[PDB]
Symmetry: none
Subunit: 52 residues, 3 copies
């Protein structure tokens, strides 16, 4: 799980989505905020289905 | 994989972690309990990700 | 994942191993060192097994 900052997430969003489509899990950190995660929807929905 | 009991681990935790960081996996056994394992974080995340990617 | 420092791991190891046996993954951090993970041996074996088999 790669960690990246906001400036990069925004400035490089196209390449981040590529990394993600390839199956990578990307954490976006923000100065003074909770971290988010970007991931493939299929994977995410698969996790959600499995949990449900 | 080396195997040690609870007491040995508790009394030697520092060197145990040094062994794990060096590239080793260490099993901790506990009387009447399921065994645990301690492994480098990077190694654990790698295995977990490869397991998920296969299963989902 | 749950994350604790070395001093805390060593002084609460029994409760840590109980947590892990109940399915919890616990990260142990150390100052100036790489983090370790403690997880049930069964879970870890299954993760790597699933990683092996994915490749073969």
């Amino acid at each position: 799980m790669q960690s990246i900052n906001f400036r990069t997430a925004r400035g490089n969003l196209s390449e981040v989505l590529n990394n993600v489509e390839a199956g990578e899990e990307v954490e976006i950190t923000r100065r003074g905020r909770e971290p988010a995660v970007i991931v493939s929807k299929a994977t995410f929905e698969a996790y959600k289905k499995a949990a449900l």
